[PDB]
């Protein structure tokens, strides 16, 4: 009310309203799902269009050969943060000849988002990210929120009506975690998970966006006729 | 450094500071530009509440940017000096690097660009000035007349007016100026410019300034007696 003019101001109950309003931009964004087994990690993203004449907004971004994310909210802020991740992944490779740990990737994003919530003039990032990766300690899935809070998970979903997919994964936890050495079945579980967040619309060929990374699988994105198999 | 965003959008999609700069232009003394077949004429109002003035040394309303281009304005006088100075420097800088004087379009585009930069730079307010830039391109006999405004938009005009009561003189020019047949001579072009100012001015004594620009850097400012002859001629024909 009087305490939401900028990010530098606390409310009387100890809340940062500008950070909460940035969190609200994620809820308006299109649904995206993340899940993993022990061998692979999968991102499934429902892309959104302006109208029938427009293209469908690309949700998934590649950060390295072994890491990438899906976005929900302000797409330009996802571009800034993914570009920062690309640089940090790349710094780790050039200097240390070392693939950046997915856990460190999260720690770096957390600290970058935080600085914007404590200084006058700037603003919080208006986007949530689901980072998947395969590193030296196996498959990983992370959930980034622009408050700074990063969380490692077996599965999750963010965006509009994400609670439907998140409940499904909470039931399916024991099944999909043991889909080892089988990419297609892990994707099928992710496609079935995102389907629980659909209302009126269904998954079409140029609407669905899938990405996968794993043991002997680089981070690759599937769009168009390549995802027709999973409808 | 002072960083404040002074020029910003409002809920209805307007930049009020730019629009309020247009009000400062509307307050300013009237300026008119009329281009003929082989010339351009820049007419300017001078308010007559100021007597005991020294017209020798008082800053003239029409300023030379180079030997072939001129700039008149309406709005804040102090702001206009800053634009004129920058334009004069750019004119010489263009001669130095391109080995050719500026076109009237290029000089206008530069001045308009400066005006635009002050509508989205931190710490600054927009220029409270609209300009009429007139002249002839190098080795060219086609007359050029351009207008700029605080927002930074610019465009070419067959004839145009700016400043206080400019909507009255624009109404006059819209019916009196023929596109198919512009003022064929210098005398015809000056007369139409003086006529248009006489709709607004008050008296035709030391209130009207006229500056005629012709091809190949041929610019001259008319004196009181020379302008007074047009005023005397128009009033006698009017009584009919």
């Amino acid at each position: 009310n009087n305490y939401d003019g900028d990010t530098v101001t606390f409310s009387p109950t100890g809340r940062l309203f500008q950070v909460e309003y940035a969190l609200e931009a994620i809820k308006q964004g299109s649904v995206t799902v993340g899940l993993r087994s022990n061998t692979h990690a999968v991102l499934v993203a429902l892309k959104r269009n302006a109208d029938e004449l427009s293209s469908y907004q690309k949700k998934i971004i590649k950060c390295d050969e072994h890491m990438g994310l899906s976005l929900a909210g302000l797409a330009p802020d996802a571009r800034v943060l993914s570009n920062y991740l690309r640089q940090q992944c790349n710094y780790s490779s050039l200097v240390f000849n070392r693939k950046l740990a997915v856990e460190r990737a999260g720690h770096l994003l957390c600290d970058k988002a935080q600085k914007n919530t404590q200084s006058y003039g700037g603003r919080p990032y208006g986007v949530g990210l689901l980072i998947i990766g395969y590193d030296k300690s196996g498959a990983h899935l992370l959930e980034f929120q622009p408050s700074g809070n990063v969380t490692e998970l077996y599965g999750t979903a963010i965006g509009a009506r994400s609670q439907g997919a998140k409940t499904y994964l909470e039931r399916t936890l024991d099944t999909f975690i043991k889909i080892d050495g089988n990419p297609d079945e892990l994707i099928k579980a992710g496609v079935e998970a995102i389907s629980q967040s659909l209302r009126d619309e269904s998954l079409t060929v140029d609407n669905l966006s899938i990405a996968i990374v794993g043991k002997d699988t680089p981070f690759t994105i599937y769009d168009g006729e390549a995802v027709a198999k999973y409808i | 450094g002072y960083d404040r965003a002074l020029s910003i959008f409002s809920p209805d999609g307007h930049i009020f500071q730019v629009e309020y700069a247009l009000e400062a232009v509307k307050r300013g003394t009237c300026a008119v530009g009329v281009k003929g077949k082989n010339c351009v004429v820049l007419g300017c109002e001078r308010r007559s509440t100021l007597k005991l003035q020294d017209t020798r040394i008082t800053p003239s309303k029409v300023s030379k940017i180079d030997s072939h281009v001129v700039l008149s304005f309406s709005g804040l006088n102090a702001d206009s000096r800053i634009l004129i100075e920058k334009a004069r420097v750019e004119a010489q800088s263009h001669r130095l690097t391109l080995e050719d004087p500026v076109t009237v379009e290029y000089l206008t585009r530069y001045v308009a660009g400066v005006q635009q930069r002050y509508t989205q730079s931190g710490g600054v307010r927009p220029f409270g000035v609209s300009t009429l830039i007139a002249g002839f391109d190098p080795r060219d006999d086609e007359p050029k007349l351009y207008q700029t405004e605080p927002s930074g938009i610019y465009s070419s005009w067959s004839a145009q007016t700016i400043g206080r009561n400019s909507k009255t003189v624009r109404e006059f020019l819209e019916k009196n100026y023929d596109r198919k047949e512009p003022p064929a001579t210098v005398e015809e072009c000056v007369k139409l410019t003086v006529r248009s100012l006489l709709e607004v001015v008050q008296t035709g004594a030391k209130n009207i300034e006229i500056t005629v620009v012709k091809p190949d850097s041929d610019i001259v400012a008319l004196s009181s007696e020379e302008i007074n002859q047009y005023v005397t001629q128009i009033e006698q024909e009017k009584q009919e």
Binding site: Y120 | V25, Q53, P59
Partner: protein
């Protein structure tokens, strides 16, 4: 952050006016009146000191009239402290021009630059404008004797006779009445004092409440002399014109 406390000194009103410039002019209208009168053979600068105290040291004082170089002087109306900042800048600018071209600065060039500085404070930087109006009296070989004025807006204009500060409306009417183009310096001296004597808010105009200066070609052959009047010299000129 600090946005909360920003007055926003360099913005337009809805009417298209600069708030701070208008209010700075309102400040200047309460300052002691300063008059400039330009004659054919010289210039007069006259100025009324702001409500003098009897224990003020008058002979070793400088409030209104300041020397910029040998050929140019200024009369001040407004904040003295602000004026001194601008004066020392103008003094430097004159010497930079002399150093560069080996010629004394033309009056208009000095005036324009000083006026351009004032303009800057109204368009950018977020600072308050200078609460000062100048009357510039000077001579050069191009235009001869010249009177200018500048104000907090940074706008300057040339004049034959002009007043700044208090009661300019009344003062300008009286100058407009009695001024003529073939006037001499000694006549202009008399006009300057008579105008102050009528427009003054004091009971009677005296030597101790005035600063006075002339710029004549009254030196020996084709050269300009600046005369900042002493107290006794103001006392004598006031008796000579029949005011006291």
């Amino acid at each position: 952050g600090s946005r909360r406390y920003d007055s926003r000194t360099t913005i337009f009103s809805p009417e298209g006016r600069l708030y701070q410039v208008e209010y700075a002019l309102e400040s200047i209208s309460h300052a002691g009146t300063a008059i400039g009168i330009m004659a054919s053979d010289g210039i007069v600068l006259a100025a009324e000191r702001k409500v003098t105290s009897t224990l003020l040291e008058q002979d070793t004082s400088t409030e209104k009239l300041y020397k910029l170089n040998d050929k140019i002087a200024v009369a001040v109306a407004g904040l003295t402290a602000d004026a001194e900042i601008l004066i020392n800048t103008a003094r430097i600018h004159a010497q930079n021009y002399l150093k560069t071209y080996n010629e004394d600065i033309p009056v208009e060039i000095l005036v324009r630059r000083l006026s351009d500085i004032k303009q800057g404070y109204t368009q950018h930087g977020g600072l308050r404008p200078f609460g000062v109006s100048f009357i510039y009296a000077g001579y050069d070989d191009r235009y001869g004797y010249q009177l200018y004025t500048s104000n907090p807006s940074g706008n300057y204009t040339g004049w034959k006779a002009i007043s700044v500060g208090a009661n300019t409306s009344a003062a300008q009417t009286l100058l407009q009445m009695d001024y003529k183009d073939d006037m001499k310096v000694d006549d202009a001296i008399e006009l300057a004092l008579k105008t102050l004597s009528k427009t003054t808010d004091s009971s009677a105009l005296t030597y101790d409440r005035l600063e006075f200066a002339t710029i004549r070609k009254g030196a020996n052959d084709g050269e300009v002399y600046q005369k900042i009047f002493k107290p006794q010299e103001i006392k004598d000129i006031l008796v000579k014109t029949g005011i006291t």
